[PDB]
């Protein structure tokens, strides 16, 4: 599985693959691996389906509480550090999930990448996450311009995952894209995204 993130100057665009494939197992027709944390904030996860879904529900609810508490929406940073801490607390249950928590705040746009031992790090650039990551970086970094919008990011995020699929037996379809263009928190869904890759094939 693989989830990509890139920081544009016009927003945050990340993408996921809904099918989660063990090796020959279609597990789910569809599955949320994209959790809407806010209209500005996202968690896009690569890893186990069941443990990731449990943890996302925690953060989403306490993201909102922290929004209510201050009268003032999270920072992208503040949720991410919450996930590193909640993972290390709960490392006595065996949850392995790698996350991309990203979004838009008063400071600007940023993504924080999380491993299931902890850590949250700042990236203003290209970040890709999962076992398809090694491939993903090759595609994403070259064609990264700092002039890149969210308009040209959606073709790029599709293309990263897409390559990955054709060298991994554990990468599913149902290629989803989430776009956070700072006006909306949009989910393209499978259908639209599938024509974008129809122009990277035939």
């Amino acid at each position: 599985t693989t989830t990509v993130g890139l920081v544009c100057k016009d927003g945050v665009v990340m993408a996921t693959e809904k099918r989660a494939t063990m090796g020959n197992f279609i597990a789910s027709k569809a599955a949320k691996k994209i959790y809407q944390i806010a209209d500005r904030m996202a968690m896009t996860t690569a890893g186990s389906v069941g443990d990731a879904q449990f943890l996302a529900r925690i953060i989403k609810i306490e993201a909102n509480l922290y929004e209510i508490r201050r009268e003032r929406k999270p920072t992208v940073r503040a949720i991410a550090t919450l996930t590193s801490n909640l993972l290390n607390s709960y490392r006595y249950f065996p949850y392995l999930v790698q996350l991309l928590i990203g979004g838009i705040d008063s400071e600007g746009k940023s993504i924080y990448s999380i491993d299931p031992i902890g850590g949250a790090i700042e990236e203003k650039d290209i970040v890709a996450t999962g076992s398809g990551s090694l491939t993903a970086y090759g595609v994403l970094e070259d064609r990264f311009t700092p002039e890149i919008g969210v308009d040209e990011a959606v073709e790029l995020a599709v293309r990263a995952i897409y390559s990955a699929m054709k060298r991994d037996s554990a990468s599913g379809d149902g290629i989803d894209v989430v776009k956070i263009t700072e006006d909306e928190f949009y989910q393209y869904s499978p259908e639209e995204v599938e024509q974008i890759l129809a122009k990277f094939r035939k």
């Binding site: 529900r57 925690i58 609810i61 306490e62 909102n64 509480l65 209510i68 508490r69 009268e71």
Partner: protein, 242 residues
């Protein structure tokens, strides 16, 4: 002396517990808040007149977000309000965690009624000396009042605090649930003036609302509230001549 109120566990000979009825008075001496429900949504309006000019105008806060679609406002010790409103957002959110559904107005109202009642039953810790307004739209607009004891009462419209009584008399005659969103806003503003025996200023009130046709929380902004205040001022002034 009495001794029916040297503890809440000591019941009065009169078939009552006076210590929790003094806990009612505690609300009263605090400043007003009114909830007005119409069938186009529910409104919640509360005092911000309190305090001199040494103070900052933004007096934080009577008008609390709890959910993004549920608001609560208070009267009483706002010491006793502050921990309960944090507890209210945690408890509300726990419903949200564990079912992935928005908490319903009624069920929230009951949970906060229950939370006061831990403190009422126990004697290791006193009853809170605060009253609560819970207003929201789950999908059906609802308005409730929580008593200091933790009693549950459904209202068409309610007030608590110093203005509890003027608002009661005003609305007994005139109010109707079949009124407009526009009428409902201005009409409880008229009622709010009488209680502080002054003319409204928009800086003297913080007003939030829950809409039925949004199904979301928004807090009203001073100058966006301003026409509602002007139109109210004709009635408020008139009714205090007499």
């Amino acid at each position: 002396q009495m001794g029916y109120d040297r503890a809440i566990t000591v019941f009065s000979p009169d078939g009552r517990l006076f210590q929790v009825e003094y806990a009612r008075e505690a609300v009263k001496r605090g400043a007003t808040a009114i909830g007005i429900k119409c069938k186009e949504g529910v409104i919640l309006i509360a005092d911000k007149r309190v305090g001199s000019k040494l103070l900052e105008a933004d007096t934080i806060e009577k008008i609390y977000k709890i959910d993004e679609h549920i608001c609560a406002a208070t009267s009483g010790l706002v010491a006793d309000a502050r921990v309960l409103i944090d507890r209210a957002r945690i408890e509300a959110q726990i419903n949200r965690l564990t079912y992935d559904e928005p908490i319903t107005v009624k069920e929230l109202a009951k949970k906060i009624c229950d939370f006061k009642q831990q403190y009422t039953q126990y004697g290791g810790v006193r009853p809170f000396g605060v009253s609560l307004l819970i207003a929201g739209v789950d999908e059906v607009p609802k308005l409730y009042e929580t008593d200091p004891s933790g009693a549950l009462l459904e209202y068409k419209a309610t007030a608590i605090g110093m203005g509890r009584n003027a608002v009661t008399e005003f609305f007994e005659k005139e109010y109707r649930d079949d009124l407009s969103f526009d009428d409902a806003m201005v009409l409880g503003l008229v009622a709010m003036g009488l209680s502080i025996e002054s003319e409204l200023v928009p800086e003297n009130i913080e007003v939030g609302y829950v809409k039925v046709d949004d199904r979301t929380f928004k807090e009203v902004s001073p100058e966006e509230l301003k026409p509602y205040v002007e139109r109210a001022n004709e009635r408020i002034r008139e009714l205090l001549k007499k």
